[PDB]
Design a protein around this ligand. Structure first.
Ligand SMILES: [Cl-]
Ligand SMILES: [Cl-]
Ligand SMILES: [Cl-]
Ligand SMILES: [Cl-]
Ligand SMILES: [Cl-]
Ligand code: NI
Ligand code: NI
Ligand SMILES: [Zn+2]
Ligand SMILES: [Zn+2]
Lengths: 133, 133
């Protein structure tokens, strides 16, 4: 979201250059891992290490600006809280992830909400399978 | 499966004590992590380290005796290839995983097989959500 600066200020928070760089990286990268972010941020702040990237992501997530989702091997990837609202389908071979509108699981989630009293988004974890493509 | 010994021999393979210990641990533990396995195996072979546990699991999985599935945070847990054929539902708070017959997703998987040409088991990765319990 591009209103992040006013929202944080209205809450007493400001992002230092390096924190903004990490936020930009998560924005720019799409499905970025902490290490991908490290690489991207170094193009501006070469002196940054991964522990700083780990903490900034923890902070940004807690602040509501960033969110994570798991992909292959259950590895978490970061994206802005407002983007990537859907289901990822991980292929059992092709290095490609297919994104699918979560409505495409409207009944399923409902079936779960009843038979188990379990409410799910279908977003946090990916779904592994085989793809004809 | 309790026929593992004859099947491996009929393929030219035998498990040393420590390899059998790890196989027993995966059997005994239910949703065990490499570290849980390490702990369990040490009760018989105290001198074993985790790297040995990592390789034995890799081997056993490749051999077909063991299989893994992801739970909370996308962490892989090991079980015997023949067991745990179902869907895990990870609660957004309670330290409990609910197992659900995968038929309880018969339509959903089908819906995916068509609209995306994606064939999925629903087993490999867990489903995160909220549980009334
Ligand atoms: Cl703003
Ligand atoms: Cl992006
Ligand atoms: Cl046997
Ligand atoms: Cl078990
Ligand atoms: Cl992981
Ligand atoms: Ni896996
Ligand atoms: Ni997570
Ligand atoms: Zn996505
Ligand atoms: Zn299970």
């Amino acid at each position: 979201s591009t209103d992040w600066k006013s929202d944080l200020r209205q809450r007493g928070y400001r992002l230092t250059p390096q924190r903004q760089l990490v936020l930009e990286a998560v924005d720019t990268l799409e499905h970025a891992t902490p290490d991908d972010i490290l690489g991207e941020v170094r193009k501006t702040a070469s002196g940054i290490n991964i522990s700083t990237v780990y903490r900034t992501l923890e902070l940004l997530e807690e602040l509501g600006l960033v969110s994570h989702a798991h992909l292959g091997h259950g590895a978490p990837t970061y994206h802005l809280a407002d983007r990537h609202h859907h289901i990822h389908l991980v292929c059992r071979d092709c290095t490609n992830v297919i994104e699918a509108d979560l409505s495409v699981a409207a009944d399923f989630t409902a079936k779960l909400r009843e038979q188990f009293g379990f409410d799910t988004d279908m977003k946090h974890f990916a779904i592994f399978g085989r793809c004809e493509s």
